[PDB]
Design an enzyme around this catalytic site. Sequence first.
Site, mmCIF file in Angstrom:
data_model
loop_
_atom_site.group_PDB
_atom_site.id
_atom_site.type_symbol
_atom_site.label_atom_id
_atom_site.label_comp_id
_atom_site.label_asym_id
_atom_site.label_seq_id
_atom_site.Cartn_x
_atom_site.Cartn_y
_atom_site.Cartn_z
ATOM 1 N N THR A 83 1.001 -1.229 -0.109
ATOM 2 C CA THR A 83 0.070 0.404 0.303
ATOM 3 C C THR A 83 0.780 1.108 -0.441
ATOM 4 O O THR A 83 1.893 1.175 0.594
ATOM 5 C CB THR A 83 -1.017 0.493 1.653
ATOM 6 N N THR A 84 0.016 2.324 -0.756
ATOM 7 C CA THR A 84 1.275 3.558 -0.640
ATOM 8 C C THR A 84 -0.174 4.644 -1.243
ATOM 9 O O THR A 84 -1.197 4.506 -2.270
ATOM 10 C CB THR A 84 2.272 3.537 -1.650
ATOM 11 O OG1 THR A 84 3.000 2.948 -1.560
ATOM 12 C CG2 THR A 84 3.085 5.290 -1.804
ATOM 13 N N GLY A 104 2.598 4.674 3.846
ATOM 14 C CA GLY A 104 3.014 3.171 3.469
ATOM 15 C C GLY A 104 4.198 2.112 2.982
ATOM 16 O O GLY A 104 5.593 2.924 3.121
ATOM 17 N N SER A 105 3.770 1.243 2.288
ATOM 18 C CA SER A 105 4.849 0.111 2.523
ATOM 19 C C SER A 105 6.028 1.043 1.083
ATOM 20 O O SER A 105 7.523 1.345 1.263
ATOM 21 C CB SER A 105 4.667 -0.878 0.880
ATOM 22 O OG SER A 105 4.120 -1.922 2.439
ATOM 23 N N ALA A 138 4.534 -4.733 -2.980
ATOM 24 C CA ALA A 138 3.343 -4.451 -2.416
ATOM 25 C C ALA A 138 2.772 -3.075 -2.894
ATOM 26 O O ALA A 138 1.342 -3.640 -2.251
ATOM 27 C CB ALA A 138 3.842 -4.552 -1.225
#
Lengths: 222, 222, 222, 222, 222, 222, 222, 222, 222
Positions: free
Chosen positions: H1-2, H140-141, H180
């Site tokens: 997720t970002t 997020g990632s 991801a």
Amino acid sequence: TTIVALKYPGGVVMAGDRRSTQGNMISGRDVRKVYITDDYTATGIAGTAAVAVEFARLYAVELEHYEKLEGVPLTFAGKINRLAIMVRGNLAAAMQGLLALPLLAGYDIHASDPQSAGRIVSFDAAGGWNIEEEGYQAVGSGSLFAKSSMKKLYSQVTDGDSGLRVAVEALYDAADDDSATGGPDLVRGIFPTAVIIDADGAVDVPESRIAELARAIIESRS
Amino acid sequence: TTIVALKYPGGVVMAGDRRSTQGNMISGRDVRKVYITDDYTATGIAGTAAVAVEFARLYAVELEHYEKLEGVPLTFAGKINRLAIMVRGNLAAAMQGLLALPLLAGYDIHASDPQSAGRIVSFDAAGGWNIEEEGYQAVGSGSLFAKSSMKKLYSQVTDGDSGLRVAVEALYDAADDDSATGGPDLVRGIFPTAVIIDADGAVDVPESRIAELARAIIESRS
Amino acid sequence: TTIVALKYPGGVVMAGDRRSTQGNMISGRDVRKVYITDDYTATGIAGTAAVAVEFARLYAVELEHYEKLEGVPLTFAGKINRLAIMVRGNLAAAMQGLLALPLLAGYDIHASDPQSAGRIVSFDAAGGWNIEEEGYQAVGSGSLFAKSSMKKLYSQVTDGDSGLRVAVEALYDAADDDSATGGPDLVRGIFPTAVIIDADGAVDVPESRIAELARAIIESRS
Amino acid sequence: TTIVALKYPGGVVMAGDRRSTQGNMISGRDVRKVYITDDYTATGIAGTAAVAVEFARLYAVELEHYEKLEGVPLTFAGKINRLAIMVRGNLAAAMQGLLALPLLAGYDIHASDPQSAGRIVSFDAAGGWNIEEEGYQAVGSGSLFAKSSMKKLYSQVTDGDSGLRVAVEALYDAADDDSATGGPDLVRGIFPTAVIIDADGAVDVPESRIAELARAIIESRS
Amino acid sequence: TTIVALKYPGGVVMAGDRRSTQGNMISGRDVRKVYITDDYTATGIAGTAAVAVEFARLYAVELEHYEKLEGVPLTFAGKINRLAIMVRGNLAAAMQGLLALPLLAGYDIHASDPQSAGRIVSFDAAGGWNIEEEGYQAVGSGSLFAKSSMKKLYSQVTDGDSGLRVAVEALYDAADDDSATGGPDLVRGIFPTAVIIDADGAVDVPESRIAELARAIIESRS
Amino acid sequence: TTIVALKYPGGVVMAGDRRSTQGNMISGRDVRKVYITDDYTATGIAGTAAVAVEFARLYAVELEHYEKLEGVPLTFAGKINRLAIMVRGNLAAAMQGLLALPLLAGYDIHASDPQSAGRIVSFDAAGGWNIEEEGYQAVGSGSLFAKSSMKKLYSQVTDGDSGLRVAVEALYDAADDDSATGGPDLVRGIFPTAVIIDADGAVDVPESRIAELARAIIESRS
Amino acid sequence: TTIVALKYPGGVVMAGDRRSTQGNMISGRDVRKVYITDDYTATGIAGTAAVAVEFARLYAVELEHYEKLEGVPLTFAGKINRLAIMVRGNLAAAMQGLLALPLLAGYDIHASDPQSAGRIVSFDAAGGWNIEEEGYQAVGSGSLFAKSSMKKLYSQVTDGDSGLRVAVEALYDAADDDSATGGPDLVRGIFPTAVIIDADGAVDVPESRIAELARAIIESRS
Amino acid sequence: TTIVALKYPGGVVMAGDRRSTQGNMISGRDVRKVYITDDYTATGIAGTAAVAVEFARLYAVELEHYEKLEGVPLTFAGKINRLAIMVRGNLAAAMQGLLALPLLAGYDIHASDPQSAGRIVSFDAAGGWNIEEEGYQAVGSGSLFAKSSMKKLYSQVTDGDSGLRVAVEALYDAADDDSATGGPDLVRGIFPTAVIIDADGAVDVPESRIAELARAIIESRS
Amino acid sequence: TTIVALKYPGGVVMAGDRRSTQGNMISGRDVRKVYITDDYTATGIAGTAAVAVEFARLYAVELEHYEKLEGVPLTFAGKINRLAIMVRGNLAAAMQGLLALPLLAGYDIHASDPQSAGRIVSFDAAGGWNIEEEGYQAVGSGSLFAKSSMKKLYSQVTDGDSGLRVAVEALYDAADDDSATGGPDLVRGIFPTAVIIDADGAVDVPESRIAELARAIIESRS
């Protein structure tokens, strides 16, 4: 310990052995593991003997209490549910060691077909219950040997007498392969206990018929 | 499992049961636990069956190796020392579960008195050994029951036959109180193995005599 | 500790040793372990001495309280149930080291035949109870030796005197094979304590008779 | 286990009990824990029985080996040093439970005053040694009781017989307060073993003398 | 710490040492460990000093509170029970290091024979209590040495003065063999404290009599 | 266990296998894992069988309770939220092994377009839900194989019959690659259970149609 | 996995299943687990597939290596010993998950009675071996169900074909009760492998005959 | 997720990717991670998807609840405080794995200068928050790669369309470096979700605009 | 990472993706995982990239070393055995974290049928190997998705072109369901690497043909 139950045309039969061990040392020789819970259901609990006796007593008290309070006995599904609730409530102590696996045999008076009114319900440790359709079940340490013996012997079951013979033979095989299960003791005259449930109710099998069945089986094996 | 040994006037007798278990499941019904190590010594090893057989084979090989190399058999104290060294050298592996506890019965040919030439040697966990002067000894899971039975029955021992009967009865009591010991199995005709050592040497007891004694004991207790 | 109980024709007898230890060190030489709980029942608790004394006191108060409140004493099944409840309540502390194992001897005045109205009940650690049918039972560290002695001596039990002598002999064998159990103290004149329950109630055996029996046994085995 | 040693004018005496236990279970009744290591030296090793026997055998072999090789016996300080080396080498095994506490009694023939040539050497776990100047020492599980009784009885020691009596009484007190030490067994006729060392050498005390002293002590205590 | 108690014809005497250590370091030289709990009973608590003082304080308050509320002092068994409950309620805190071991000396005024009215009660870790019948008892780290000294010296106890001398001598022996127990401090003039209970009540012994007794003992052992 | 669900033009179809295992041992052969929760929604729970049955029963009870209390069925989002809350509340018990992961298929009766009113909702371990947009979903141990088979077979889904065939083939592939999923049983006559939901409600598919489809698939694979 | 072996008049038969799973995923469908080790011995290893294959290869190489080196093949006891030594050496890695459980079938060409020359040897985890006299044996995860099926069908065994039928039926029962053992794949045409050893040697059974037997069994149980 | 969020003159824009993973397995392809909390406030929560959805629902409910109770919406500082309280009340769940890091985008209507009324608030695990003055933020990632992309591309942000283009390009970079994070899927036509907040409120961005922006970015990168 | 291999009439084809990830961060985009080990065998190793490259180089060196030493190449079984020995030797590192699972594709020039000479050998974690008869096999994190794609697509494989297309599509499906597998990068122009082995040998598939196939697959699935 081993308890076996099987359906025959017109009813059900549940039998159990008599041995109680504490590790490898034999502490009991005439234990009774099959209880007539009510006029149409018998219960048999494997595992810790203490917990088995407690669960049988409390389950019978619960069924009698409901029937007295509401003037009508529980349906078979209600009895199954209450037993499953007891098993689930025992989960923490079972992880701690005080463990009980019940096996329920019953006659469904409300069933439409009197011949196929026999019911056998098995329980797993998590509280789930399964109504047996194969016509037989076993619980205890020698349950696998008993089940594999009944698999081969079940085609001979046509009445109460042949069903009782097959149950006694299953217990004999379970004791023959597992040292925690007691075989028929001819020196002391101690034999497995059995309960037969039909349309006329649940009646204890007298020790004489079980004794002669066990003697016939032992003569056949010799 | 249980191996008993007892001295009678003029020699020693050593009997062993036949059952081997893996947990509570019975896996062997005719295991032989008493070995004639040499013409005048028998050994019987309780514990893990694999290590028991390995120990018996190694001990017999070692004794025969010495006898061939030096041309003269070991004295009895020498045999005891070799067995104790084996037990001491197995301590680390027994800490992992490959335990073995031997019991040695012998007839000392150098003893001045032939009527008191029987010897019983018990080995403890750490390799210590004791020559039993009470005249009987037992090893295994049912060893305490067999010892307490022999304590009461040892006043009936006067010759080889009564000694053998008492040993078989001690094994019967051990099997009665302990599920890891196999009792006389009349269905398959499997009976405890026995070895009698006297001035003439060590000889296996034929199965017919032990069967007769076991049947007499079973009848007496019925 | 060792506490033995055995049924004789017409009643029951319960005897117990007098030694209490803290590890290997003897800390008490005249401990009394057999209590007369009520006029027709006696109890003997093995394990930690503090918990044994507390359990005996609490159980006697419970039975007395019920009898006073209801005007009628508990049935033998009620007494067994209360003792089992106490043991099951103890389980949690027993895992910590306050382990107490009771043994119950009683005379059931509600039985059909007064010649077989003696009852012996054993309890397991988890709380399960078993009414003994073999006629004798033992608890404590020397329980195995005492039971294996009674197995051989029970054919001699005919009346209260025979039962008392066999009980004292079994305690002697238990002390002979177990260091935590104390045998008859001939120098100090300290002997096991016994209670005999028959139709006339539960009475403490005078120390003179037990001294005579212990001396007879010692002279027999010398 | 208890081994005592005490000096008397003209020599030393070392005495030991006969019991060996497996936890709480009595497994040996006639064990010998006092060994005549050489003509003027006795050793007694408490602790694990197997390790005690092995240590006695090894120490005797080492002393005789030096004597044969060098044509002259070791001095007393050399003997103490060799025993301390064995104890210090047993440290890892003692951590693994194979513990051995030696006690050395000797007669120093090279010593100046022949009336004070007796020597008692106590060894701690780490291999340290101390020549006792108080005139008495004990090792084993009941060593504290034996030492505390010898403190009160050492004023009565004037010769070999009084010293032997005091040693037997100290062993009696150790067995009185400690259950892992065996007292005089008047039933089986098994008594503590003793070795008296003086200018003429080390001799085992015959069983009759120790039996008489033990009976006298018992009758005095009654 | 060591506290001794012994019965003599017509009463009981209880003495205690004065040293308190925090590890190997001597922190207290005149600690008082024997308390007059009430007019006919004294208590002496070994273990941690803080818990000992708190326990004596609470016990005295509890006995006095009952006496004031009910108008009659507790029977001796009642006092024993209250002290035992106080000990048992301390198991959780003693597992963390706050251990307190009480020893109770008393004079049963309600006893039949006033000469044998003295009572010595010893408590174990779990809360069990035992009324000593041998006539002497000790608690603390030097308890075993003091008990073994009293075993040999108790035949000299004929009245209160000889009983006091034997108690002081037992304390001297415990201090001799244990570094946590303080001996008579002739440099600082600090001596064990003592309390004598007889039919007239419980009185602290004056320090001069104890000083002269200790000086006599010291000049005897020199 | 493996449960598949897939949308087709005008409805949704959900199928499940029948095998229940304990480890690698087959314990059940006719387990029904797809429940008609209410007239327009079916649910199928993978994981532990006990928790699956209990979750389905409780979820149906909750939906019916709301419908009766308020007189109107919940919206589809409300049912999803209730099931997600029930999954989230089981996070503690799911860690210790009582896992239950549901798959919810329904016919959104409030949707504007009748031909696209089939809804599939998958749930994750933490209670998060996702309304599937690819048209198919699977839960259980063989879910990956079932999904990768439905990926290739979904182009053939055009109505109820093709959707049912594709669901049965996906279950067949899951059983072909996973041993915890049971395939069609042509010997016992046990086949996967299916439910079809469309505008007229949710109906169980009769065993005859599923048997025909499974046999057609098996014959195509041969 | 499941490997069954059984003796019939004139030889021995050895069958095995084909499934290999890693966890629950079916990783192999045509594994071969019965190896013709030499002209009169077949071996079959259960457990880790890699270890099974490498053990079969090592054993065959060892036997042929001895035969080439010494010009004469090993006796059957020598073969058993080499296999047992291989298992004992593997024990350490077997604790690490690389378990191998062998089952040995042979024809003793030096046996006096060729009609009884078939031998079945089982091995336990510790490396011990037993020659089965019951006439059948099984290894693998489904070995219990296979053994309990053969216990009931061994009466039928009269020749090679009857023995082969019982072996396939035993494997069918094992696969019916166990999910790690593969049943007969009528879809792929994969059936259990079998080896028959008689006086003429050890021959692989052609796949067609086992296919006919398996189809007959499936028809029988339909 | 970002999730990215950047200010442009006259408002703020927030964009998020659509991939949801379960380890390395892609479980979701069209997850909506940006929510319109209220008319002038959007929120984007990264981490566990279940917790993200629950947090968004709770936060929106709380804001609307206050606005309805008071008739006036919360100030921006109040909304920030409520979100930080919600974060800090989830520390225990975050420590066990239910992490949820929010990112707040808002239009402060009460701000003095309309052009610079856009607000970006970043939150940490402990609950602390910062109003970001650099003009952009990401969670997020792939937050680091998106941050470093916006750092270089923020000089081109002049109006709403350029801000949207820069947000989409930053998401593309984050997906290009982090597996991801889900990039623009041209095959399925799934693109990042975006919300533009200005003086007229918060508006969901049409998918067509994001699709053409993403295609232009992809073409420029080819 | 995913490496697929499949057999077609007249040879074999092995293809692999290009992505290398360190957790969630994409480190490499053009990794070559399929190596032409020798003129007729290709190998592809999944797991740690370092270990994969090291294994490929070391295995090729071993094969060429043997061929140069002995003047003749290894047989295919010998190559399989060498690879299996490398896998088994890497077990300690694989437990440590340097896991490498190989997949071997080859052409057996010594095969009876050139059209069936294609060989696929999968290796398990323990070093055991299996020649696949399905005709397709995949290794890596996306191997399950690739295998379940080939299970459906394999009927279309009739020559090298169709086989290569199916391998590329299987890689596409694996990347579709797995985030650690790299799909066709239409932007950077990076496509899976394929090797085709037939009678003429093993040859790398040119990038342009794989690009055309990937573009066709992408357009078909759009």
